[PDB]
Symmetry: C2
Subunit: 105 residues, 2 copies
């Protein structure tokens, strides 16, 4: 997986993989972008006691890390409203969200 579409996400332990980059929703509740073995970006949500966190691209454009209850602990703060969005891990190392769809076959 290198992309997320509307209301898709990463469960604890799941990742987006494009070598040498991995975007991992970790067990410690931190969302971390690794470049080879080095962390280059994090959501800074790594909190003892917080397990079962998930990162979800919402259908309003917002990318959110939720804790096990439903508390939003980090967001991209990209609410644009109704649309079709995708989040992509690119091979230039950036994770980016595009929307809304402008063409299709």
């Amino acid at each position: 997986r290198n992309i997320l579409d509307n209301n898709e996400g990463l469960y604890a332990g799941q990742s987006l993989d494009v070598e040498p980059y991995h975007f991992i929703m970790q067990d410690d509740c931190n969302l971390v972008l690794y470049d080879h073995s080095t962390s280059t970006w994090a959501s800074n949500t790594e909190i003892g006691g917080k397990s079962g966190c998930s990162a979800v691209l919402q259908s309003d454009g917002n990318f959110v890390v939720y804790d096990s209850s439903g508390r939003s602990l980090w967001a991209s703060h990209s609410t644009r409203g109704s649309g079709n969005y995708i989040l992509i891990l690119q091979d230039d190392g950036n994770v980016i969200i595009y929307g809304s769809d402008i063409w299709s076959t």
Copy 2:
């Protein structure tokens, strides 16, 4: 490869692969979406004696097939303005362009 970013393209012979689907910039200058061995969408640009064609997603949102001397033979007609866009060959066999970017990093 399943995506093209800005001023990335498929040159002659190149393709996006998400099994069982292929988006191929063929040597006959036709840009064709295959579902297994069946063409389900084409640019219809195998013209008589055209070769070395390329399909490039541009920074204005337009997706264009060019001949070897840079004449535009087909376009998506999806110009939305200067920004950042991606074309995705999706798991459901749809090819779609999203953009412009709303978040990154």
